[PDB]
Amino acid sequence: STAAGQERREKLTEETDDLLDEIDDVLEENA
Amino acid sequence: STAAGQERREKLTEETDDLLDEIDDVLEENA
Amino acid sequence: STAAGQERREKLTEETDDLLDEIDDVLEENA
Amino acid sequence: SARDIHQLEARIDSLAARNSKLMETLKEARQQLLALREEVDRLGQPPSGYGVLLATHDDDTVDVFTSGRKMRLTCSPNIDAASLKKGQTVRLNEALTVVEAGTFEAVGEISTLREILADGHRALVVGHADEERVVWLADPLIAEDLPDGLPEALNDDTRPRKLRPGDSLLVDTKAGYAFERIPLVP
Amino acid sequence: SARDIHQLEARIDSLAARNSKLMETLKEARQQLLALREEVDRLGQPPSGYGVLLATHDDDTVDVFTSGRKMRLTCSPNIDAASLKKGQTVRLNEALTVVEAGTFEAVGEISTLREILADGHRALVVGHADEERVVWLADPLIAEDLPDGLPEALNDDTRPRKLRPGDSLLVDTKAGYAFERIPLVP
Amino acid sequence: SARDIHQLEARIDSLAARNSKLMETLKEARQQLLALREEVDRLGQPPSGYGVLLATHDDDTVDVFTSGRKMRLTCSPNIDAASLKKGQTVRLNEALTVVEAGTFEAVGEISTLREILADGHRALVVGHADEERVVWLADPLIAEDLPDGLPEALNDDTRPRKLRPGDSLLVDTKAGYAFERIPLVP
Amino acid sequence: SARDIHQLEARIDSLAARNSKLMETLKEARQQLLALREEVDRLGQPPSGYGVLLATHDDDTVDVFTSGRKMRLTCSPNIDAASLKKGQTVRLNEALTVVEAGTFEAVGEISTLREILADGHRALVVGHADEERVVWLADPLIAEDLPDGLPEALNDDTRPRKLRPGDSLLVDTKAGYAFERIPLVP
Amino acid sequence: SARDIHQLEARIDSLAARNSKLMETLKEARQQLLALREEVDRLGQPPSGYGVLLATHDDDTVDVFTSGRKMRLTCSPNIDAASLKKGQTVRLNEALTVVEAGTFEAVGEISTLREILADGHRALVVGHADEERVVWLADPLIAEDLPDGLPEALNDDTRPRKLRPGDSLLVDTKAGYAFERIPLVP
Amino acid sequence: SARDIHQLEARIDSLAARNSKLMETLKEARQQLLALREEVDRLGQPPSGYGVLLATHDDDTVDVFTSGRKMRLTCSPNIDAASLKKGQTVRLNEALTVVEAGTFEAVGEISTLREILADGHRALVVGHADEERVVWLADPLIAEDLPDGLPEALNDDTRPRKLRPGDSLLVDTKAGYAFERIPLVP
């Protein structure tokens, strides 16, 4: 484990929960 | 020894010498 | 090898290539 | 002017059903992009350590062997204050804090048993090179509820008992514990 | 009514609006599954480690024996969780995480065996200096589908057989496992 | 004089001034002793390791053995500088600092002994492969108050006795120490 | 007014030749301050690792031994897909990637060879203390082009062959590979 | 109007002596919050190291063994450039520089001394299992002023002397040095 | 012409301009050679390690054996590349870089030899309990300028002789090297 591998996994599930919050914002205004 | 244990001992004797300099500032104006 | 020994070798060949570029700038205007 | 409505009714009714197809086929990439995600969030939380517990001290402190040595560490709430038996395999997180009960690593060196010691918690074993070592025994050798199995002049000792000197029991020299019993068959 | 035409030219632009940005959220998520998978793939990429596995778990976890110690490890989606045969060289990226599966380390200490156990999963092995140890045997010695031998005075069989009390087995003393059969001729 | 009343109403507010902020510097310093002590306590808190000690230093420092090497090492206020017997499992927190004092590693290699020495603190022990080493003995073998023994053909007493040239001692070949007596059977 | 020019012509012609001297003698401290510099830029790039090769895999992946263990890692572009021989010395960088083909570290434990194995890749050897071990063989023992050397009633084996059972070959027990042949003279 | 003064004189004289009490009882928490403080500033400065000295080089450089290996390092002002004897126990700081002179760790392996060497510095010893080794000797075995003690036809050898072939000396195989003498009594 | 005087008062201030800043670029570069050299010197400064070398490379690189593994390693300008004899104690700073050269490990495992080899660079050594290994010989045993024996039945010489099949050699089993001869008394 590295200080570079730990900072690439916090940035992948962080552009993630940003897509999940735009994701459930596209499924509720399309109804 | 850690980078977190070393930074907790420089902050304990630093709120210390700040109390020791107010300390000998209370014992000399009370005389 | 340390984080202090690595930063002393990038600063020695960096005041170096700065002297080498002033160096070949003194040998071509002296001709 | 009838054509006019038709043309719409027919775009609607044919964008509608493209809508619904894209819906579902876009959900089906969420159940896949979700269960695929959380399997990478588990591959992020650190792995676990195993080791052998020497004894209980009387707080929530315990003596364990782990990576080559003997160290004392804390017990998370969730595990049994003192109802973890003497010298079982246990488990440790990253920062060496205890989390689970286990069994009896039944694999290692095999020794013969010379005598139990004075205080019935320790024993003298000879190993493979004629050499004399001192090991503690882990619970399932001393708990009261264990028979004498009558004599040996009627034979078949395949089942549990009290540790009679002349036995083979299994030990982890480095650690310091014994682990269980073994038939010698001629 | 000239109101019906205007009511539809609306629902039409209504659907065309949601439709233009659905056909795109797919194109985004469809990328991220192609990025996540791309990352799981990028684990198995070297530099990479090795070491045997003592047991299987239910929650996609395992008992391996890398670098001299027992360790419970998080394994990869690339992975067939219960087609993991007991005691099989497995592989690890840096922060230990299991990627491929391999075979059976086929080199090291040669011990001879004295008998199997009640457990039938474990055996008494005598190494060289008459040291008797206890290993488990990886499946391929108690997969049921093994022939029952016939004697060895109508010459050299040494063809995949059932485990006989006299053979020579190849072991990793330091982990706890046997690995395979082997001929000796005198 | 109406000047005496005004001269005092001053010295009164003079004292009431110093008094209001004395009753407070205490309350601050009184906290910091409750914080410092709180920190020394927080050392002994696990995760925590062990290892034996070789000798006593005067300036509140000690000669320990932990992970293979000899190490002089700072010990805690919590701690009783003089009551540290020679060769006694002592405990350590991460950055090596002594916290508790313990008993006596009571498990390991058994050697038999040949004679004490001129030093009476050091003895010649023969282990298993006729390998004669030199350990120190922890005090509980040369405290004064040890009975002389009487012979052993009126049976197995093995009470706390004076070191006899044929006994078995338990040792840590690595540290340099003995630790206790032990009965052998005839 | 002639003196006047002379005085100049003579300063010029005498600052000119101080110019040229300083030129060259200032260059000559660049060829020295340059070749001295780059020899410190090489003392900056990290140092080189040596491993031992185990098997080839099909990708650009290979099994090698290094600090203690057994690990698979990648190959640089500049080296040869499959033309690096089963078990030779090889070389590594910082982050453990391969670069160079070596030979056959012929220095380590000596054993006798009992019988070859089933599948002409592995062998049973006895060590020094009678211990039976299993090593694989590096190429220069199974390369097809090897003489059977006739009998041994006419003697002088200083030259290569196929490894008759009863040979001295040279092995790195830890690794698992037999590196080459050796005589037993008169 | 007399009451008036009294009332003040009596508040003064009774805040005055509350003053003084708070004074002293607030000092007494400084002698405690000070001597308690500096004992935690010592628990901050890193620990010491022990290693054995080989030879002296001519600068202020010296050859010492320490954490497993052999290393050369500098000598702080406060110690004697050369007048520290052949291989005594010595002491180390953090970044491995020497501070103190020591004794002669007299604990470890015991060999017999076959012959001294050619250059009166080194010797051949048999160890425990017949193995021949070569150790150098630390001063108190060659330093000029040592008796030959006559012979042994009249006996009592408890006292120092010159190294006879056939003696027992105490050795740290790993390191390379022999630390002193020992009797075999009849 | 009053134009010739003005044409020169120009070339004079022209040269005086380049001349004033040449006499200075020297003074700068002259400093940096006094800084670079100052840095190379500052390598050999402790703390510093040791360990044998296995072979020479052409481009100011080397095959050392420090801390257990084999390592090609960048070496210093301070150093004479090809003046390095094979099997010499050499010296290293933190990030391994060779600075000094030394002698020959003169201590450790002692062992008898059986014969030289084809290579006459390599020999068969029998260690203690019959463990026949293969080590390289450091130059000092096959330098040209060594006399050929004359028998040893008209008494002990141990004056630098050429290598004979019965003598004793001091070896570092680990690296793979011999180091020197030794007298054995009969």
Swiss-Prot record, chains A, B, C:
Region (Mpa/ARC ATPase binding): 1-31
Modifications the protein undergoes after translation, according to the UniProt entry: Is modified by deamidation of its C-terminal glutamine to glutamate by the deamidase Dop, a prerequisite to the subsequent pupylation process.
Alphabetical keyword list: Coiled coil, Isopeptide bond, Ubl conjugation pathway
Example GO molecular function: proteasome binding
Coiled-coil features, chain-numbered ranges: 3-31
Domain of life: Bacteria
A Gene Ontology BP annotation from the UniProt entry: modification-dependent protein catabolic process
Stated role: Protein modifier that is covalently attached to lysine residues of substrate proteins, thereby targeting them for proteasomal degradation. The tagging system is termed pupylation. Among the identified substrates are the FabD, PanB and Mpa proteins.
Entry domain remark: The N-terminal unstructured half of Pup provides a signal required to initiate unfolding and degradation by the proteasome but is not needed for pupylation, while the C-terminal helical half of Pup interacts with Mpa to target proteins to the proteasome.
Quaternary structure and partners: Strongly interacts with the proteasome-associated ATPase ARC (Mpa) through a hydrophobic interface; the interacting region of Pup lies in its C-terminal half. There is one Pup binding site per Mpa hexamer ring; the K(D) measured is about 3.8 uM.
Similarity comment: family membership: Belongs to the prokaryotic ubiquitin-like protein family.
Note: The glutamate must be located at the C-terminal position to be coupled to the lysine substrate. Fusion of Pup to a nonproteasome substrate targets it for proteasomal degradation in an Mpa- and proteasome-dependent manner.
Protein name per UniProt: Prokaryotic ubiquitin-like protein Pup
UniProt organism field: Mycobacterium tuberculosis (strain ATCC 25618 / H37Rv)
Gene that specifies this protein: pup
Shown residues in whole-protein numbering: 21 to 51 of 64
UniProtKB/Swiss-Prot annotation, chains D, E, F, G, H, I:
Post-translational modification: Mpa thus promotes its own turnover.
Gene knockout outcome: Cells lacking this gene accumulate pupylated proteins. These cells also become hypersensitive to reactive nitrogen intermediates (RNI) and are severely attenuated in both wild-type and nitric oxide synthase 2 deficient mice. Moreover, they display increased resistance to hydrogen peroxide.
Family listed: Belongs to the AAA ATPase family.
Entry note about domains: Consists of three main regions, an N-terminal coiled-coil domain (residues 1-96) that binds to protein Pup and functions as a docking station, an interdomain (residues 97-245) involved in Mpa hexamerization, and a C-terminal ATPase domain of the AAA type (residues 246-609).
Oligomer and partners: Homohexamer. Assembles into a hexameric ring structure that caps the 20S proteasome core. Strongly interacts with the prokaryotic ubiquitin-like protein Pup through a hydrophobic interface; the interacting region of Mpa lies in its N-terminal coiled-coil domain. There is one Pup binding site per Mpa hexamer ring; the K(D) measured is about 3.8 uM. Upon ATP-binding, the C-terminus of Mpa interacts with the alpha-rings of the proteasome core, possibly by binding to the intersubunit pockets.
Stated role: ATPase which is responsible for recognizing, binding, unfolding and translocation of pupylated proteins into the bacterial 20S proteasome core particle. May be essential for opening the gate of the 20S proteasome via an interaction with its C-terminus, thereby allowing substrate entry and access to the site of proteolysis. Thus, the C-termini of the proteasomal ATPase may function like a 'key in a lock' to induce gate opening and therefore regulate proteolysis.
Miscellaneous notes: Was identified as a natural substrate of the M.tuberculosis proteasome.
Protein's UniProt name: Proteasome-associated ATPase
Source organism of this protein record: Mycobacterium tuberculosis (strain ATCC 25618 / H37Rv)
Lineage of the organism: Bacteria, Bacillati, Actinomycetota, Actinomycetes, Mycobacteriales
